[PDB]
Write a protein that holds these residues in place. Structure first.
Motif, PDB file in Angstrom:
ATOM      1  N   UNK D   1      41.607  36.562  11.824  1.00  0.00           N
ATOM      2  CA  UNK D   1      41.309  37.295  13.048  1.00  0.00           C
ATOM      3  C   UNK D   1      42.407  37.110  14.078  1.00  0.00           C
ATOM      4  N   UNK D   2      41.518  38.818  15.768  1.00  0.00           N
ATOM      5  CA  UNK D   2      42.628  39.054  16.687  1.00  0.00           C
ATOM      6  C   UNK D   2      43.282  37.746  17.161  1.00  0.00           C
ATOM      7  N   UNK D   3      44.578  37.802  17.475  1.00  0.00           N
ATOM      8  CA  UNK D   3      45.314  36.670  18.064  1.00  0.00           C
ATOM      9  C   UNK D   3      46.223  37.151  19.182  1.00  0.00           C
ATOM     10  N   UNK D   4      46.015  36.626  20.385  1.00  0.00           N
ATOM     11  CA  UNK D   4      46.820  37.012  21.543  1.00  0.00           C
ATOM     12  C   UNK D   4      48.203  36.392  21.467  1.00  0.00           C
ATOM     13  N   UNK D   5      49.240  37.229  21.500  1.00  0.00           N
ATOM     14  CA  UNK D   5      50.617  36.759  21.307  1.00  0.00           C
ATOM     15  C   UNK D   5      51.475  36.887  22.558  1.00  0.00           C
ATOM     16  N   UNK D   6      50.476  38.626  23.820  1.00  0.00           N
ATOM     17  CA  UNK D   6      51.240  38.471  25.064  1.00  0.00           C
ATOM     18  C   UNK D   6      50.610  38.416  26.451  1.00  0.00           C
ATOM     19  N   UNK D   7      51.266  37.717  27.367  1.00  0.00           N
ATOM     20  CA  UNK D   7      50.926  37.834  28.780  1.00  0.00           C
ATOM     21  C   UNK D   7      51.939  38.303  29.833  1.00  0.00           C
ATOM     22  N   UNK D   8      51.820  39.555  30.249  1.00  0.00           N
ATOM     23  CA  UNK D   8      52.769  40.119  31.190  1.00  0.00           C
ATOM     24  C   UNK D   8      52.055  40.449  32.483  1.00  0.00           C
ATOM     25  N   UNK D   9      52.215  39.587  33.476  1.00  0.00           N
ATOM     26  CA  UNK D   9      51.574  39.788  34.763  1.00  0.00           C
ATOM     27  C   UNK D   9      52.492  40.580  35.678  1.00  0.00           C
ATOM     28  N   UNK D  10      51.954  41.008  36.815  1.00  0.00           N
ATOM     29  CA  UNK D  10      52.779  41.566  37.897  1.00  0.00           C
ATOM     30  C   UNK D  10      53.784  40.779  38.753  1.00  0.00           C
ATOM     31  N   UNK D  11      54.703  41.488  39.405  1.00  0.00           N
ATOM     32  CA  UNK D  11      55.625  40.852  40.336  1.00  0.00           C
ATOM     33  C   UNK D  11      54.816  40.150  41.421  1.00  0.00           C
ATOM     34  N   UNK D  12      54.065  40.944  42.176  1.00  0.00           N
ATOM     35  CA  UNK D  12      53.130  40.425  43.157  1.00  0.00           C
ATOM     36  C   UNK D  12      51.770  40.440  42.502  1.00  0.00           C
ATOM     37  N   UNK D  13      51.191  38.141  44.098  1.00  0.00           N
ATOM     38  CA  UNK D  13      49.886  38.407  43.506  1.00  0.00           C
ATOM     39  C   UNK D  13      48.811  38.310  44.581  1.00  0.00           C
ATOM     40  N   UNK D  14      47.860  39.239  44.537  1.00  0.00           N
ATOM     41  CA  UNK D  14      46.774  39.286  45.510  1.00  0.00           C
ATOM     42  C   UNK D  14      45.771  38.172  45.247  1.00  0.00           C
ATOM     43  N   UNK D  15      45.307  36.682  48.524  1.00  0.00           N
ATOM     44  CA  UNK D  15      45.737  35.778  47.463  1.00  0.00           C
ATOM     45  C   UNK D  15      44.627  35.426  46.472  1.00  0.00           C
ATOM     46  N   UNK D  16      43.440  36.008  46.653  1.00  0.00           N
ATOM     47  CA  UNK D  16      42.400  35.988  45.602  1.00  0.00           C
ATOM     48  C   UNK D  16      42.589  35.374  44.203  1.00  0.00           C
ATOM     49  N   UNK D  17      43.528  35.929  43.433  1.00  0.00           N
ATOM     50  CA  UNK D  17      43.680  35.585  42.017  1.00  0.00           C
ATOM     51  C   UNK D  17      44.380  34.242  41.916  1.00  0.00           C
ATOM     52  N   UNK D  18      45.499  34.108  42.622  1.00  0.00           N
ATOM     53  CA  UNK D  18      46.206  32.836  42.690  1.00  0.00           C
ATOM     54  C   UNK D  18      45.200  31.702  42.848  1.00  0.00           C
ATOM     55  N   UNK D  19      44.293  31.863  43.803  1.00  0.00           N
ATOM     56  CA  UNK D  19      43.283  30.856  44.093  1.00  0.00           C
ATOM     57  C   UNK D  19      42.396  30.537  42.881  1.00  0.00           C
ATOM     58  N   UNK D  20      42.170  31.504  41.996  1.00  0.00           N
ATOM     59  CA  UNK D  20      41.417  31.233  40.767  1.00  0.00           C
ATOM     60  C   UNK D  20      42.043  30.109  39.954  1.00  0.00           C
ATOM     61  N   UNK D  21      43.371  30.031  39.960  1.00  0.00           N
ATOM     62  CA  UNK D  21      44.086  29.025  39.172  1.00  0.00           C
ATOM     63  C   UNK D  21      44.184  27.653  39.862  1.00  0.00           C
ATOM     64  N   UNK D  22      43.272  27.389  40.799  1.00  0.00           N
ATOM     65  CA  UNK D  22      43.161  26.087  41.451  1.00  0.00           C
ATOM     66  C   UNK D  22      41.703  25.691  41.612  1.00  0.00           C
ATOM     67  N   UNK D  23      41.447  24.390  41.526  1.00  0.00           N
ATOM     68  CA  UNK D  23      40.192  23.811  41.988  1.00  0.00           C
ATOM     69  C   UNK D  23      40.323  23.388  43.448  1.00  0.00           C
ATOM     70  N   UNK D  24      41.544  23.047  43.865  1.00  0.00           N
ATOM     71  CA  UNK D  24      41.820  22.637  45.239  1.00  0.00           C
ATOM     72  C   UNK D  24      42.917  23.497  45.857  1.00  0.00           C
TER      73      UNK D  24
END
Lengths: 191, 197, 172, 194, 136
Positions: D1-24
């Motif tokens: 089975x599917x296997x993820x091989x890519x991650x292509x994010x945007x230049x800019x980031x709204x700050x909502x999402x950035x904050x998801x990648x933190x507990x603090x």
RNA sequence: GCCAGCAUCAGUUUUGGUGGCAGGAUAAAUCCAUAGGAAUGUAGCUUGCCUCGGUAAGUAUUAUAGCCUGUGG
RNA sequence: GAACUGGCGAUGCGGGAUGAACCGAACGUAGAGUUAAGGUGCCGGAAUACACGCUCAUCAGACACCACAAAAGGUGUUAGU
RNA sequence: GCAGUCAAGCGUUCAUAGCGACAUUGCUUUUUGAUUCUUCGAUGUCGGCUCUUCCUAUCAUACCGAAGCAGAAUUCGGUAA
RNA sequence: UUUGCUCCACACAAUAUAGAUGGAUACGAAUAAGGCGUCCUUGUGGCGUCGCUGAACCAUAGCAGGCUAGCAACGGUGCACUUGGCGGAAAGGCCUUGGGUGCUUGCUGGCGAAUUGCAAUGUCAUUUUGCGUGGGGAUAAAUCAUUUGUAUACGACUUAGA
């Protein structure tokens, strides 16, 4: 008893030419061509002259040997429809409700449509196979006819046609309604 | 007789190819069966699926988990029956099971690389012609193995990104033949076929 | 049983003051050794005559050879296997080179087809046939035909090693 | 089975999402997505690099998405970053649609209609360590009984000498996914609009 | 337009067909299947090749492509005659088969000093063949 | 003292080769002479197909293949 | 519950998967060799030996004590009279 | 307790659509007997309540044969838990 | 919080080895059939040929492979630079150009090898980690405490906070 060697002779008629490598056969002819696989069987096909082919079985156990007289008849039945062609007439039958059969086309497709069978509101739809054509013969009240090369898509396409019209929960014998394979022959008349 | 050993299951007999690879093993012979989805077995397809059918009901009552896991995946299967024949539950076992890998279809670090067969375990020399047989290929499907068609694509492939390895290894070795008879009547080549060669 | 040797065993019925020169009985035997033989001997006489290993004695015990071993003959053979139930008679035919296969092959055949043993079979009589045709069962008659020929299809070859390099083949 | 091989994010980031990648969030230097942001300086060569990298292989695209959380009454600020499978034609079209929509919004009505039949998915309202009687549907024992009504009597038989998986016992009720379907849609709303 | 039906090119067992033997005494020796007892059994003979007259098993013998005319039954002198007439062995050692055999007895019969020569000579050869593998 | 290597012997075994003799129907055969024999009949010949003839089909006892069965050595 | 003997109980050992009693064989401590009863695809030391047959079982079969199956039927196949 | 085999007869007429005498071969351990191997330094005796799970010798539901099945109703039977 | 960390190097210490001691040497399909070459109408085509086991094929001579001189060749192959391509099934590899430079056993030589004392694996692989010198790079989270209640027996979960 473990017969030492069997054989038959496929009579090649003229027209027709039957290439064979391995146990793929290729019936080239007037009416079209036909092919078949037999990898499952184990026989040695052997040319003697255009007109003749000797299909053998060396050291066969009795169940192996019936598979030798079928093969023959299999290679004959691709020669036959390839020349004289098959024609599987079907008569309709009915004590009361008149069976109405037609041909539609939804996506390609070629469906026999089979209506008002025993005043079912159902619709029964048979898929017409490839090779084969459907005629509603005039002169003969009621006579659907299936006419191909092979025998072993026709007699089936027919058979299904006959079998999509089975009566449910009645005594067979009173309710004799249905479509049936009365005729079997070839496209060419005389023979 | 080597460090590794790449068998190609195809035309095999679980069963037999089965052993040999467990035996081996217990004798330090890292092995790596591939292809597999094209295994094989005595018996009309139907069965076996009958056969299969069971080693399926056999559970654990009281917790369907913790019980006999029914893999599907050709691989796994071969495996198993291999296994069964390698006492695991000890160390020498295990030190055995490692040595052995297994995949359906020849992935990479093998598609390269050569492979072999195991005669004594080839359908085609065990059986007698006429007897029906299987194809772990179907089997696996049929008792549910999501992936047989994703292999059967990556097959169409590498049966080529091979061939065209080939029609290239072969137009080579051939010139070496039309440039190997110019130099050989040479002196070196007559003494030679006296010693042999 | 084992491998056989034809045997000629010529017993008596011990001599008496009363009946000196007590008539001599020949029997062709199909056994393993002269211990068999002298055995297989007395078993048959204690069925036709009133004697036994006692009131007896074995005069001679001569290996017999085939005359033309070389020579492929067609041995009909007659046989009284007991079964599980009653007892039955038979007339099998066995194409073979000499007696001493005609009896070996037979015993294997009477084993496989009928699950009998050496115990339970009496090889009534054996008879080189001279002419074909007196030959009556299709699994011989198969082979007594015009310039006979056949292939040996699906030739499998036998290797020693564990692995191999080629993926075979069954041409011939 | 599917296997993820890519991650292509945007230049800019709204700050909502950035904050998801933190507990603090407050304590951090807020570095997430500043060396990937570079990568977008380089035209963006290192960037068609991966999008072309998908096209070449890959049977299945999926857009990464997140929610306009602070544009709603909730007390959250950290958005929900999901994965979306595309369903258009050809692999190249699919990555091509995304490429156009990096940092771009997408309102219900691109997606939903009147009279569609939707499949909604949620972690079900949680309740805690619930008794067997309510977690299961088991009958209450009679008033009479000692040591307690709200139980199953026989937990199981003599043998199969182990309490079975297929009996009823107290534990977590609620907080489960659950994919209920066929939730006709009655209205496509627009903020926008008194 | 004609039929064409590959062929299916087997070596028969029949009166004549000649057989290398592989077991067992004979082994590595040519004989002529004279009679033919049944499917698996045949009566072998090879007076010229040092081979007795024997009822063998058609597994323990292998069918050569060679054959010859031989009548049914015929005894050992009579086989020896038909034998140099068709001249058996002279067709046999002409094939690749007997050569591959005689090649390998040779490689087995090689000596520690000879094996050193064959590497010297193969080194000679690699060179020259690697030669034209560059120009052409 | 510790650890081994070879040699030639002992005791006990194991695994091979190779020859000399004694029996058997003084093996049987094959092989040579000497008698009988047949056919799944080789050659010649005859008859009918059939591309200038080889298939057949006969006939027939070694002839331009051999086969079986016995006596004697 | 009796008769003849042999066992077990009082007895390990190898073998029957396992088991007082069945098959081998009865014990000081060790070294070589040979076997018994059982075996020799792999768990497992040992022939995926050789030879001739029978059998395909949409519930095959697999070895004494022993952990089962019958009457009755089959143009499934094999010999027979 | 549930099943087979032959078939005197019943079933208008006809042995076997459906039954089936005289006979006879089985299976089962939900009956009860027989037995006394385990437990008398204790394995908590009946039945109901509650709650899983397994068996199929199938009452219903699915799909088909069979009838003394005209339809309706009903009987025997299959694969099926 | 002791000037840490990351990548490539090499130095030294260690610590292992389910077990290098020339080389895992790449069609695919059928086996009651195919391979390889060749001609042609490109076909299930004609013609030749091979198997009958890798006992093959490749590599293989120099103090564990030394220092040196030439002849014949314009090839072979190591090592490191670099042009361009292929491959995602675990790609982590494969091919190819253009050079920089060794060794060349393709044929001919010349020195050295001893005493490791009649054998003793007679140690030349590749595991992971640690401590410092030296050539490039980067410059963070999480947990508690506090807080929320879409969460909750308690842990966990979910949010909030220069």
């Amino acid at each position: 008893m473990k017969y030492i060697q069997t054989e038959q002779q496929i009579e090649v008629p003229e027209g027709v030419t039957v290439s064979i490598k391995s146990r793929i056969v290729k019936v080239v002819g007037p009416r079209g061509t036909l092919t078949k696989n037999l990898k499952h069987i184990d026989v040695t096909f052997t040319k003697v002259n255009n007109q003749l082919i000797k299909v053998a079985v060396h050291n066969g156990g009795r169940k192996h040997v019936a598979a030798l007289r079928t093969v023959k008849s299999l290679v004959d039945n691709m020669i036959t429809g390839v020349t004289k062609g098959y024609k599987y007439k079907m008569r309709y039958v009915y004590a009361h409700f008149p069976i109405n059969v037609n041909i539609v086309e939804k996506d390609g497709a070629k469906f026999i449509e089979v209506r008002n069978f025993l005043g079912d509101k159902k619709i029964r739809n048979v898929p017409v196979r490839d090779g084969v054509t459907i005629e509603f013969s005039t002169n003969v009240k009621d006579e659907i006819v299936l006419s191909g090369n092979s025998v072993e898509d026709v007699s089936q396409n027919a058979a299904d046609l006959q079998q999509i019209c089975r009566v449910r929960n009645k005594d067979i014998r009173k309710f004799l309604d249905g479509i049936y394979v009365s005729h079997k022959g070839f496209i060419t008349e005389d023979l | 007789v080597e460090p590794v050993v790449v068998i190609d299951g195809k035309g095999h007999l679980v069963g037999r190819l089965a052993s040999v690879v467990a035996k081996q093993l217990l004798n330090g012979q890292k092995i790596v069966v591939v292809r597999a989805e094209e295994l094989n077995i005595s018996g009309e397809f139907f069965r076996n699926k009958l056969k299969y059918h069971d080693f399926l009901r056999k559970a654990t009552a009281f917790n369907k988990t913790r019980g006999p896991f029914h893999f599907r995946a050709p691989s796994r299967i071969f495996y198993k029956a291999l296994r069964g024949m390698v006492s695991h539950k000890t160390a020498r076992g295990k030190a055995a099971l490692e040595r052995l890998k297994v995949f359906e279809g020849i992935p990479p670090p093998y598609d390269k690389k050569k492979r072999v067969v195991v005669p004594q375990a080839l359908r085609v020399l065990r059986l007698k012609p006429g007897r029906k047989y299987t194809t772990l290929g179907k089997l696996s499907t049929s008792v549910g193995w999501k992936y047989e068609d994703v292999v059967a694509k990556l097959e169409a492939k590498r049966k080529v990104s091979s061939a065209e390895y080939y029609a290239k290894k072969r137009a080579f070795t051939k010139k070496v033949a039309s440039a190997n008879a110019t130099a050989a009547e040479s002196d070196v080549a007559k003494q030679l076929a006296a010693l042999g060669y | 049983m084992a491998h056989f040797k034809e045997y000629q065993v010529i017993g008596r019925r011990l001599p008496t003051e009363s009946v000196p020169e007590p008539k001599l009985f020949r029997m062709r035997i199909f056994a393993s050794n002269e211990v068999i033989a002298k055995s297989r001997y007395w078993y048959f006489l204690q069925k036709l005559h009133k004697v036994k290993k006692a009131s007896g004695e074995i005069v001679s015990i001569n290996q017999i050879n085939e005359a033309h071993p070389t020579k492929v003959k067609n041995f009909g053979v007659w046989v009284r296997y007991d079964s599980r139930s009653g007892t039955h008679n038979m007339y099998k035919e066995i194409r073979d080179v000499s007696r001493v296969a005609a009896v070996e092959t037979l015993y294997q055949d009477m084993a496989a087809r009928h699950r009998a043993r050496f115990r339970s079979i009496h090889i009534l009589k054996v008879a080189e046939i001279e002419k074909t045709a007196d030959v009556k069962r299709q699994y011989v008659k198969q082979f007594l035909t015009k310039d006979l020929k056949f292939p040996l299809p699906h030739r499998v070859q036998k290797s020693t090693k564990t692995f191999s390099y080629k993926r075979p083949s069954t041409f011939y | 089975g599917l296997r993820s091989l890519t991650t292509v994010w945007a230049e800019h980031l709204s700050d909502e999402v950035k904050r998801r990648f933190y507990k603090n969030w407050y304590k951090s230097k807020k570095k997430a997505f500043t060396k990937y942001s570079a990568k977008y300086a380089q035209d963006g060569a290192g960037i068609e690099r991966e999008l072309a990298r998908i096209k070449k292989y890959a049977s299945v695209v999926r857009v990464l998405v997140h929610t306009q959380i602070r544009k709603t009454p909730l007390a959250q600020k950290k958005a929900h970053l999901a994965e979306i499978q595309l369903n258009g034609g050809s692999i190249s079209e699919k990555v091509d649609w995304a490429r156009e929509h990096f940092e771009k919004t997408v309102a219900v009505d691109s997606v939903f209609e009147q009279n569609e039949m939707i499949d909604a998915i949620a972690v079900t309202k949680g309740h805690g360590f619930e008794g067997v009687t309510h977690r299961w549907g088991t009958k209450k024992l009679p008033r009479k009984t000692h040591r307690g009504l709200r139980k199953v009597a026989c937990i199981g038989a003599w043998h199969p000498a182990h309490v079975m998986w297929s009996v009823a016992r107290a534990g977590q009720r609620g907080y489960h996914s659950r994919t209920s379907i066929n939730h006709k849609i009655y209205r496509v709303g627009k903020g926008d609009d008194e | 337009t004609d039929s064409i039906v590959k062929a299916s090119n087997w070596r028969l067992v029949e009166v004549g067909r000649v057989v290398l033997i592989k077991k067992g005494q004979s082994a590595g020796k040519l004989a002529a299947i004279v009679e033919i007892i049944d499917q698996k059994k045949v009566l072998i003979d090879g007076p010229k090749a040092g081979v007795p007259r024997q009822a063998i098993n058609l597994g323990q013998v292998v069918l050569t492509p060679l054959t010859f005319a031989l009548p049914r039954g015929a005894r050992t002198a009579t086989v020896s005659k038909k034998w140099a007439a068709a001249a058996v062995c002279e067709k046999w050692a002409a094939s690749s088969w007997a050569k591959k055999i005689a090649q390998r007895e040779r490689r087995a019969a090689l000596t520690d000093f000879e094996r050193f020569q064959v590497m010297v000579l193969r080194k000679q050869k690699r060179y020259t063949v690697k030669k034209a593998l560059a120009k052409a």
